[PDB]
Amino acid sequence: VRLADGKVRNPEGIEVNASLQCNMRCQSCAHLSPLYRRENADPAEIHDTLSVLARSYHASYAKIMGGEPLLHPDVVGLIEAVRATGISDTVLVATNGTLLHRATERFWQAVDSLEISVYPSRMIAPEEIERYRVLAREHGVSLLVNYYGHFRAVYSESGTDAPDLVRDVFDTCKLAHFWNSHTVYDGWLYRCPQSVFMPRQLRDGGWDPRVDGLRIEDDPAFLERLHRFLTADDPLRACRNCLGSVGKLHPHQELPRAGWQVTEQLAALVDYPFLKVCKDDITADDGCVERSLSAPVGGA
Ligand SMILES: C[S@@+](CC[C@H](N)C(=O)[O-])C[C@H]1O[C@@H](n2cnc3c(N)ncnc32)[C@H](O)[C@@H]1O
Ligand SMILES: CN[C@@H]1[C@H](O)[C@H](NC)[C@@H](O)[C@H](O[C@@H]2O[C@H](C)C[C@H](O)[C@H]2O)[C@H]1O
Ligand code: SF4
Ligand code: SF4
């Protein structure tokens, strides 16, 4: 992340969650979407908030995602609301693909890039993926299809009191330091989806996630506040209940809603060998994607 020409520049993306809910129930969903009921972003509200933020912030892309963004009633309108702010160079939609065959030609015209996460329990036939590749080529859309074999544990209601562990997890966290998973929610900016979406779903009520957020504002001192927030190198309140990027690997599966919540003590869920690996190289592959199909667009 850089400070240049009056704005904080993110070489990665700003994340806009169209829908907090999902039609799947993946174990260890990083946004805890299986625990959320229907909540669809207001395109006008998103446009206003990102318009304010764009005066001081620019990213390479805007990632429209959430739980499952294709559940949104007006995803093209949300896409265009994001594009109109100029906050990013391109607009990307990330989807589990289970609803992509319902999308109309305005969806394919509206997106710049499309990322489909394909999971074992909701497999898309290779011929349907080929159809998606053809549609993407036809509309000049960069396409990435990731076939997930595993997920890593992401959080627990039983957090840790060990400050060294929190520091190790935050220090190796790809979301905070590498992917720059900056997340806009309800007028606040967050370093990561976990810090805003996980506390609200802890069964004891959690805490106010705004302690880890930055209120999005226009005032002449917003830029510097933003730069300090996005460059700060101290763990968040949420890291004490988060596994970051070093959670234990497990086969990807869906679980029933009943008992979905995680209670095992956080220290038991750290993949300590992988934590060493990531301590040496923060970009180390997480082992979650088993196969990937990429169809880029020339000149992109
Ligand atoms: C919340 S999902 C994005 C929305 C969309 N429904 C999807 O899954 O593609 C965020 C991204 O992180 C991945 N993800 C979610 N939970 C994960 C976990 N526990 N470990 C590794 N990747 C995870 C998903 O595969 C997806 O690429
Ligand atoms: C291997 N799979 C990764 C990978 O493809 C990344 N490519 C840079 C991508 O950034 C990741 O996505 C982010 O994963 C976080 C857990 C949450 C965040 O909301 C989401 O954007 C995705 O999981
Ligand atoms: S498809 Fe799975 S990982 Fe993606 S939002 Fe839904 S439950 Fe979470
Ligand atoms: S809560 Fe902490 S460890 Fe978890 S994703 Fe955010 S910065 Fe990373």
Ligand SMILES: [Cl-]
């Ligand atoms: Cl045709």
Ligand code: NA
């Ligand atoms: Na559509």
